[PDB]
Write an enzyme that holds these catalytic residues in place. Structure first.
Site, PDB file in Angstrom:
ATOM      1  N   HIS A  27       3.156  28.397  29.470  1.00 31.52           N
ATOM      2  CA  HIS A  27       2.647  28.114  30.792  1.00 31.52           C
ATOM      3  C   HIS A  27       1.384  28.885  31.066  1.00 31.52           C
ATOM      4  O   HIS A  27       1.086  29.820  30.358  1.00 31.52           O
ATOM      5  CB  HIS A  27       3.739  28.389  31.893  1.00 31.52           C
ATOM      6  N   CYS A  28       0.604  28.482  32.059  1.00 31.88           N
ATOM      7  CA  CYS A  28      -0.487  29.350  32.542  1.00 31.88           C
ATOM      8  C   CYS A  28      -0.138  29.680  34.006  1.00 31.88           C
ATOM      9  O   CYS A  28       1.041  29.642  34.415  1.00 31.88           O
ATOM     10  CB  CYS A  28      -1.898  28.716  32.403  1.00 31.88           C
ATOM     11  N   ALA A  29      -1.155  29.988  34.814  1.00 34.80           N
ATOM     12  CA  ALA A  29      -0.886  30.440  36.165  1.00 34.80           C
ATOM     13  C   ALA A  29      -0.393  29.300  36.988  1.00 34.80           C
ATOM     14  O   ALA A  29       0.271  29.544  37.996  1.00 34.80           O
ATOM     15  CB  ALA A  29      -2.171  31.095  36.795  1.00 34.80           C
TER      16      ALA A  29
END
Length: 95
Positions: A27-29
């Site tokens: 995932h990212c932010a």
């Protein structure tokens, strides 16, 4: 909402992508990023209808589900118990 909110989204997402269609997940932010075997069997419209999903994109092998900050981590933490190859949690460094 009840505390299962994030596990329901994770399950709906896994169900629409296909469990054995998933290579690995991180995932990212703001996005859940799923490396998939075959994008062409993933019904984007059904993904987009899942609670909290802001949009979806596929590029460069990555099926990306935009969940927004904080919601993305809570969904990731549910997927993390499901046993798929999640990668964010890098594995123990050896001495």
């Amino acid at each position: 909402s009840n505390a299962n909110k994030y596990n329901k989204i994770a399950n709906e997402l896994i169900k629409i992508i296909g469990e054995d269609n998933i290579i690995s997940i991180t995932h990212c932010a703001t996005r859940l990023r799923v490396m998939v075997k075959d994008r062409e069997i993933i019904n984007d419209k059904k993904v987009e209808k899942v609670d909290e999903v802001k949009g979806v994109f596929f590029t460069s092998g990555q099926y990306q589900i935009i969940l927004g900050t904080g919601i993305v981590n809570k969904v990731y933490a549910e997927v993390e118990k499901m046993g798929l190859k999640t990668l964010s949690k890098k594995e123990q460094d050896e001495l």
